[PDB]
Design a protein around this nucleic acid. Structure first.
Length: 109
RNA sequence: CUAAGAAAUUCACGGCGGGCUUGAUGUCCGCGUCUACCUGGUUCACUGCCGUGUAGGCAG
């Protein structure tokens, strides 16, 4: 979850719903798991279901930056495409958790 | 047209003190090397000889 650095504390309260229950997908859609133990009115339930959709959906406009890479690639019989690569946060999290049980851990030690 | 394109790491210092490596010893033993012959290399391409000048009798 990339975003405002001094605003990533409410993300823990929004994402604790995938801990304990199975109601992480109950806050935005399927608010029957957010009406009985939420204890808010229709304005509060609607405002929560509207504000919780702005995480997984788009946050801003699709763009790039001058400090990005944006390589060129020659085409087979044409000009070029600009290739702007990105950092695989999901893949590096998966390989990082994969290697922390392979270098140390219970069985590997 | 390259994870393209850009960049000052700076500075300082006590490692220090001590000390028994000891003792012993059999290297023994044997043997056929064998035959063969022409330097006056020019031990300076000439020493030393009547004129230091280009012709000459000598130890040849």
């Amino acid at each position: 979850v990339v975003g405002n650095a001094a605003a990533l504390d409410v993300f823990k309260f929004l994402s604790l719903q995938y801990q304990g229950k199975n109601l992480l997908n109950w806050l935005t859609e399927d608010s029957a798991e957010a009406l009985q133990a939420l204890s808010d009115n229709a304005e509060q339930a609607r405002e929560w279901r509207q504000a919780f959709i702005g995480i997984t959906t788009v946050k801003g406009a699709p763009a790039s930056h001058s400090l990005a890479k944006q390589l060129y690639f020659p085409l087979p019989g044409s000009g070029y495409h600009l290739l702007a690569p990105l950092f695989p946060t999901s893949l590096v999290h998966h390989v990082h958790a994969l290697l922390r049980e392979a270098r140390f851990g219970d069985a590997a030690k």
